[PDB]
Short mmCIF file of N, CA and C in Angstrom, two decimals:
data_model
loop_
_atom_site.label_atom_id
_atom_site.label_comp_id
_atom_site.label_asym_id
_atom_site.label_seq_id
_atom_site.Cartn_x
_atom_site.Cartn_y
_atom_site.Cartn_z
N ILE A 1 127.51 291.12 245.07
CA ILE A 1 128.28 290.87 243.87
C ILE A 1 129.60 290.24 244.26
N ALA A 2 130.32 290.95 245.17
CA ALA A 2 131.63 290.44 245.63
C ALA A 2 131.56 289.92 247.06
N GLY A 3 132.51 289.13 247.40
CA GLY A 3 132.56 288.55 248.73
C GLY A 3 132.72 287.12 248.77
N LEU A 4 133.04 286.45 247.60
CA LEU A 4 133.25 285.10 247.49
C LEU A 4 134.70 284.84 247.02
N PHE A 5 135.04 283.55 246.92
CA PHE A 5 136.37 283.14 246.42
C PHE A 5 136.61 283.58 245.05
N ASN A 6 135.64 283.46 244.14
CA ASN A 6 135.71 283.84 242.82
C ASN A 6 134.57 284.72 242.37
N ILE A 7 134.74 285.60 241.44
CA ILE A 7 133.73 286.51 240.97
C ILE A 7 133.45 286.23 239.44
N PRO A 8 132.42 285.34 239.17
CA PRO A 8 132.10 285.18 237.76
C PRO A 8 131.60 286.37 237.00
N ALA A 9 131.05 287.30 237.73
CA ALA A 9 130.51 288.55 237.13
C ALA A 9 129.49 288.16 236.04
N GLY A 10 128.62 287.22 236.26
CA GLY A 10 127.63 286.78 235.31
C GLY A 10 128.17 285.78 234.32
N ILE A 11 128.52 286.16 233.15
CA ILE A 11 129.09 285.28 232.06
C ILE A 11 130.42 285.90 231.68
N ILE A 12 131.22 284.97 231.01
CA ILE A 12 132.48 285.30 230.49
C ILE A 12 132.34 286.18 229.25
N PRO A 13 132.91 287.40 229.16
CA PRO A 13 132.73 288.23 227.94
C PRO A 13 133.55 287.61 226.78
N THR A 14 132.94 287.82 225.61
CA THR A 14 133.62 287.35 224.33
C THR A 14 134.48 288.44 223.77
N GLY A 15 135.58 288.69 224.49
CA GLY A 15 136.54 289.71 224.01
C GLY A 15 136.18 291.09 224.58
N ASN A 16 135.57 291.90 223.77
CA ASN A 16 135.19 293.25 224.21
C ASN A 16 133.68 293.44 223.95
N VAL A 17 133.17 294.63 224.49
CA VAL A 17 131.79 294.91 224.38
C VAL A 17 131.47 295.28 222.91
N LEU A 18 130.45 294.66 222.35
CA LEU A 18 130.02 294.93 221.03
C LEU A 18 129.11 296.13 220.94
N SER A 19 128.52 296.38 219.72
CA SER A 19 127.63 297.44 219.48
C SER A 19 128.17 298.83 219.66
N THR A 20 129.47 298.91 219.85
CA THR A 20 130.20 300.19 220.03
C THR A 20 129.55 301.05 221.15
N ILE A 21 129.62 300.47 222.37
CA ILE A 21 129.07 301.14 223.58
C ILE A 21 130.05 301.10 224.68
N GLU A 22 129.91 302.01 225.63
CA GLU A 22 130.82 302.05 226.81
C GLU A 22 130.62 300.84 227.71
N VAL A 23 131.73 300.47 228.41
CA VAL A 23 131.58 299.34 229.29
C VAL A 23 130.83 299.71 230.64
N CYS A 24 130.63 300.99 230.87
CA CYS A 24 129.94 301.43 232.05
C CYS A 24 128.48 301.66 231.80
N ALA A 25 128.15 302.53 230.79
CA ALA A 25 126.80 302.87 230.44
C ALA A 25 126.04 303.37 231.67
N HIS A 26 124.88 302.74 232.00
CA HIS A 26 124.17 303.10 233.22
C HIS A 26 124.37 302.03 234.27
N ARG A 27 124.73 302.46 235.47
CA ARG A 27 125.01 301.55 236.60
C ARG A 27 123.67 301.15 237.23
N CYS A 28 123.25 299.95 237.11
CA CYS A 28 122.02 299.42 237.69
C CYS A 28 122.37 298.32 238.63
N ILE A 29 123.08 297.23 238.27
CA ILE A 29 123.40 296.15 239.19
C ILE A 29 124.90 295.90 239.18
N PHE A 30 125.55 296.46 238.14
CA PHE A 30 127.00 296.31 237.99
C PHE A 30 127.68 297.65 238.25
N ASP A 31 128.64 297.64 239.16
CA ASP A 31 129.40 298.82 239.56
C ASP A 31 130.92 298.61 239.66
N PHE A 32 131.39 297.40 239.39
CA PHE A 32 132.80 297.14 239.50
C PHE A 32 133.43 296.94 238.16
N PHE A 33 134.46 297.64 237.79
CA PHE A 33 135.18 297.55 236.54
C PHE A 33 136.66 297.54 236.80
N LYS A 34 137.36 296.71 236.05
CA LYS A 34 138.86 296.56 236.21
C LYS A 34 139.41 296.08 234.87
N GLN A 35 140.24 296.85 234.32
CA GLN A 35 140.92 296.55 233.02
C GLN A 35 142.40 296.34 233.24
N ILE A 36 142.94 295.31 232.67
CA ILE A 36 144.41 294.92 232.78
C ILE A 36 145.06 295.05 231.40
N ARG A 37 146.42 295.17 231.42
CA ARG A 37 147.14 295.33 230.21
C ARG A 37 147.79 293.93 229.81
N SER A 38 148.55 293.36 230.70
CA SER A 38 149.24 292.03 230.42
C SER A 38 149.30 291.27 231.68
N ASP A 39 148.56 290.18 231.80
CA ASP A 39 148.54 289.30 232.96
C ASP A 39 148.13 290.08 234.21
N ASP A 40 148.49 289.52 235.38
CA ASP A 40 148.20 290.18 236.71
C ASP A 40 149.17 289.61 237.73
N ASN A 41 149.16 290.19 238.91
CA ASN A 41 149.96 289.76 239.99
C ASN A 41 149.27 288.85 240.95
N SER A 42 149.85 288.44 241.98
CA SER A 42 149.37 287.51 243.03
C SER A 42 148.83 286.22 242.30
N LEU A 43 149.65 285.73 241.45
CA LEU A 43 149.30 284.47 240.76
C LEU A 43 149.20 283.24 241.69
N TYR A 44 149.84 283.29 242.86
CA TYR A 44 149.79 282.22 243.80
C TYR A 44 148.84 282.59 244.96
N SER A 45 147.55 282.30 244.74
CA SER A 45 146.52 282.58 245.75
C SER A 45 145.31 281.70 245.47
N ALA A 46 144.89 281.05 246.54
CA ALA A 46 143.76 280.14 246.47
C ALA A 46 143.07 280.09 247.81
N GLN A 47 141.98 279.38 247.89
CA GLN A 47 141.25 279.20 249.17
C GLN A 47 140.54 277.87 249.11
N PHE A 48 140.86 276.91 250.03
CA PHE A 48 140.26 275.60 250.12
C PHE A 48 140.42 275.09 251.58
N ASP A 49 139.38 274.36 251.99
CA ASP A 49 139.29 273.84 253.34
C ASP A 49 139.97 272.43 253.32
N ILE A 50 141.26 272.36 253.55
CA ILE A 50 142.02 271.09 253.53
C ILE A 50 141.77 270.39 254.84
N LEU A 51 141.99 269.05 254.76
CA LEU A 51 141.77 268.13 255.97
C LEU A 51 142.62 266.94 255.78
N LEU A 52 143.45 266.61 256.72
CA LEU A 52 144.37 265.46 256.65
C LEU A 52 143.94 264.55 257.82
N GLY A 53 143.28 263.43 257.52
CA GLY A 53 142.87 262.51 258.53
C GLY A 53 141.52 262.85 259.17
N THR A 54 140.77 261.90 259.51
CA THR A 54 139.46 262.04 260.15
C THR A 54 139.66 261.71 261.63
N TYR A 55 139.67 262.80 262.46
CA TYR A 55 139.75 262.57 263.92
C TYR A 55 138.41 262.18 264.56
N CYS A 56 138.48 261.25 265.43
CA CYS A 56 137.27 260.83 266.04
C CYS A 56 137.62 260.29 267.47
N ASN A 57 136.60 260.21 268.33
CA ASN A 57 136.81 259.73 269.69
C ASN A 57 136.74 258.22 269.77
N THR A 58 137.30 257.69 270.82
CA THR A 58 137.38 256.22 271.00
C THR A 58 136.57 255.86 272.27
N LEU A 59 135.71 254.88 272.07
CA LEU A 59 134.84 254.34 273.15
C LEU A 59 135.13 252.86 273.38
N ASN A 60 135.30 252.47 274.69
CA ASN A 60 135.56 251.10 275.00
C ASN A 60 134.28 250.30 274.69
N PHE A 61 134.47 249.06 274.15
CA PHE A 61 133.40 248.13 273.80
C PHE A 61 133.02 247.37 275.08
N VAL A 62 131.91 247.78 275.79
CA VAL A 62 131.49 247.08 276.98
C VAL A 62 130.07 246.65 276.76
N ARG A 63 129.74 245.40 277.05
CA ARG A 63 128.48 244.78 276.94
C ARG A 63 127.98 244.19 278.24
N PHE A 64 126.74 243.68 278.26
CA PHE A 64 126.21 243.14 279.46
C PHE A 64 126.61 241.69 279.69
N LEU A 65 127.31 241.02 278.72
CA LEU A 65 127.74 239.64 278.88
C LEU A 65 129.11 239.68 279.53
N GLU A 66 129.14 239.88 280.87
CA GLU A 66 130.33 239.91 281.63
C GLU A 66 130.23 238.94 282.82
N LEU A 67 131.43 238.48 283.21
CA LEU A 67 131.42 237.45 284.26
C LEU A 67 131.11 238.09 285.68
N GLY A 68 131.17 239.37 285.75
CA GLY A 68 130.88 240.01 287.04
C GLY A 68 129.48 239.79 287.48
N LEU A 69 128.49 239.97 286.56
CA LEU A 69 127.11 239.70 286.96
C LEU A 69 126.91 238.26 287.29
N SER A 70 127.57 237.38 286.49
CA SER A 70 127.35 235.90 286.69
C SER A 70 127.95 235.43 288.02
N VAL A 71 129.04 236.14 288.46
CA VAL A 71 129.67 235.72 289.74
C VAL A 71 129.06 236.45 290.90
N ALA A 72 128.30 237.56 290.68
CA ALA A 72 127.62 238.30 291.78
C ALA A 72 126.26 237.74 292.03
N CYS A 73 125.49 237.56 291.02
CA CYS A 73 124.13 237.03 291.12
C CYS A 73 123.93 235.67 290.47
N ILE A 74 122.78 235.10 290.51
CA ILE A 74 122.47 233.86 289.86
C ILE A 74 122.12 234.13 288.44
N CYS A 75 122.82 233.40 287.55
CA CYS A 75 122.65 233.53 286.04
C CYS A 75 121.84 232.32 285.54
N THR A 76 120.70 232.63 284.85
CA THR A 76 119.89 231.64 284.27
C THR A 76 119.23 232.19 283.04
N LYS A 77 118.85 231.27 282.13
CA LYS A 77 118.19 231.61 280.92
C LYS A 77 116.88 230.91 280.77
N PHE A 78 115.81 231.65 280.42
CA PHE A 78 114.43 231.17 280.26
C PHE A 78 113.92 231.66 278.87
N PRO A 79 114.39 231.08 277.82
CA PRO A 79 113.93 231.55 276.48
C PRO A 79 112.50 231.25 276.24
N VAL B 1 157.94 273.45 285.34
CA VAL B 1 158.90 274.54 285.61
C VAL B 1 158.87 274.86 287.12
N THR B 2 159.94 274.46 287.83
CA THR B 2 160.02 274.67 289.23
C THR B 2 161.23 275.40 289.60
N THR B 3 161.30 275.90 290.82
CA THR B 3 162.49 276.54 291.30
C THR B 3 163.63 275.58 291.53
N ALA B 4 164.88 276.06 291.26
CA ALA B 4 166.01 275.17 291.46
C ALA B 4 166.20 274.67 292.84
N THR B 5 166.08 275.56 293.82
CA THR B 5 166.21 275.12 295.19
C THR B 5 165.10 274.15 295.63
N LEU B 6 163.87 274.43 295.21
CA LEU B 6 162.72 273.54 295.50
C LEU B 6 162.93 272.21 294.92
N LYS B 7 163.29 272.13 293.62
CA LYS B 7 163.49 270.84 292.98
C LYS B 7 164.66 270.05 293.53
N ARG B 8 165.70 270.71 293.95
CA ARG B 8 166.85 270.11 294.61
C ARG B 8 166.40 269.54 295.92
N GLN B 9 165.63 270.27 296.74
CA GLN B 9 165.19 269.76 298.04
C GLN B 9 164.27 268.61 297.81
N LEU B 10 163.36 268.63 296.83
CA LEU B 10 162.52 267.58 296.54
C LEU B 10 163.26 266.27 296.13
N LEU B 11 164.28 266.41 295.21
CA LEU B 11 165.02 265.29 294.82
C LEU B 11 165.96 264.78 295.89
N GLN B 12 166.29 265.57 296.90
CA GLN B 12 167.14 265.10 297.97
C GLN B 12 166.26 264.47 299.08
N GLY B 13 165.02 264.87 299.20
CA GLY B 13 164.22 264.31 300.32
C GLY B 13 163.28 263.18 299.99
N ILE B 14 162.47 263.40 298.85
CA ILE B 14 161.44 262.46 298.52
C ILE B 14 161.70 261.81 297.14
N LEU B 15 161.70 262.67 296.14
CA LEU B 15 161.77 262.20 294.75
C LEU B 15 163.15 261.61 294.48
N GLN B 16 163.18 260.65 293.60
CA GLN B 16 164.44 259.97 293.21
C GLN B 16 164.56 260.01 291.66
N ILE B 17 165.83 260.13 291.25
CA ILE B 17 166.16 260.19 289.76
C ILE B 17 166.78 258.90 289.34
N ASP B 18 166.18 258.32 288.27
CA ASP B 18 166.65 257.05 287.76
C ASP B 18 166.64 257.11 286.26
N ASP B 19 167.08 258.19 285.64
CA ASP B 19 167.12 258.44 284.22
C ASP B 19 168.58 258.68 283.81
N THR B 20 169.00 258.09 282.68
CA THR B 20 170.33 258.29 282.06
C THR B 20 170.28 258.62 280.62
N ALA B 21 169.19 258.45 279.93
CA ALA B 21 169.19 258.68 278.51
C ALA B 21 167.97 259.65 278.15
N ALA B 22 167.73 259.84 276.88
CA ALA B 22 166.70 260.74 276.43
C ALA B 22 166.21 260.28 275.06
N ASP B 23 165.15 260.88 274.53
CA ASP B 23 164.54 260.61 273.24
C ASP B 23 164.71 261.73 272.34
N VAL B 24 165.22 261.48 271.16
CA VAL B 24 165.49 262.48 270.09
C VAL B 24 164.72 262.05 268.84
N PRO B 25 163.80 262.90 268.38
CA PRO B 25 163.03 262.55 267.13
C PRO B 25 163.98 262.52 265.94
N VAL B 26 163.64 261.62 264.98
CA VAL B 26 164.40 261.45 263.75
C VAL B 26 163.59 261.76 262.56
N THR B 27 162.56 262.57 262.69
CA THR B 27 161.73 263.01 261.57
C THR B 27 161.65 264.54 261.56
N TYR B 28 161.98 265.15 260.41
CA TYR B 28 161.97 266.60 260.32
C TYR B 28 160.55 267.13 260.04
N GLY B 29 159.64 266.30 259.49
CA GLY B 29 158.33 266.78 259.21
C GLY B 29 158.21 267.67 258.00
N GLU B 30 159.18 267.70 257.11
CA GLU B 30 159.17 268.52 255.95
C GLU B 30 158.35 267.88 254.91
N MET B 31 157.37 268.66 254.31
CA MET B 31 156.53 268.20 253.21
C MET B 31 156.18 269.37 252.31
N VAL B 32 155.73 269.00 251.09
CA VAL B 32 155.32 270.01 250.09
C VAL B 32 153.99 269.62 249.56
N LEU B 33 153.27 270.57 249.04
CA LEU B 33 151.95 270.48 248.44
C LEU B 33 151.89 271.07 247.04
N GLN B 34 151.17 270.41 246.17
CA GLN B 34 151.04 270.87 244.80
C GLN B 34 149.71 271.63 244.66
N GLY B 35 149.77 272.80 244.04
CA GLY B 35 148.61 273.67 243.83
C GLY B 35 147.67 273.21 242.71
N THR B 36 148.00 272.27 241.95
CA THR B 36 147.17 271.79 240.89
C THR B 36 145.88 271.14 241.46
N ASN B 37 146.06 270.37 242.57
CA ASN B 37 144.90 269.79 243.22
C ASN B 37 143.92 270.90 243.81
N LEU B 38 144.48 271.96 244.34
CA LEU B 38 143.69 273.03 244.88
C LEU B 38 142.99 273.72 243.77
N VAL B 39 143.63 273.93 242.68
CA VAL B 39 143.06 274.62 241.49
C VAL B 39 141.90 273.77 240.94
N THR B 40 142.14 272.47 240.80
CA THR B 40 141.09 271.63 240.29
C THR B 40 139.86 271.52 241.22
N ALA B 41 140.12 271.51 242.49
CA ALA B 41 139.10 271.52 243.48
C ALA B 41 138.24 272.79 243.39
N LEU B 42 138.96 273.96 243.27
CA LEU B 42 138.25 275.19 243.28
C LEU B 42 137.46 275.37 241.94
N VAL B 43 138.03 274.92 240.85
CA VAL B 43 137.31 275.06 239.56
C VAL B 43 136.13 274.07 239.44
N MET B 44 136.10 273.01 240.29
CA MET B 44 135.03 272.09 240.21
C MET B 44 133.92 272.34 241.24
N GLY B 45 134.26 272.95 242.41
CA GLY B 45 133.28 273.19 243.45
C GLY B 45 133.02 272.01 244.38
N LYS B 46 132.45 270.93 243.85
CA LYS B 46 132.14 269.73 244.59
C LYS B 46 133.11 268.65 244.15
N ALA B 47 133.82 267.97 245.07
CA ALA B 47 134.72 266.95 244.68
C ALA B 47 134.84 265.97 245.88
N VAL B 48 135.33 264.75 245.56
CA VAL B 48 135.48 263.67 246.54
C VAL B 48 136.93 263.47 246.74
#
């Protein structure tokens, strides 16, 4: 039930419990209850995975079309 | 981080000093963030 950033607890209640019944009744899958009077504390609290900039490695662009091979061996083309 | 005597001996025997100035940063790096973006991201779940 708990262990996440937010606890929806199923659906948002429409005020109070109707049918004139207790909010606890029989505990089957629900066991957490909390009633407040006016607002709450810790109003500045959140959780998000922020990220500034995409860090990546740099690789030199090296190809086989280099003058070293042409100056070391004989270069020819036979298409 | 080296010993004073060792660094003095090194600078007198082998190493040479040719520095007269330094570099001082001119950016404090102070910035602020608004919680509205975090709230909207949390209330949406998936965002770009």
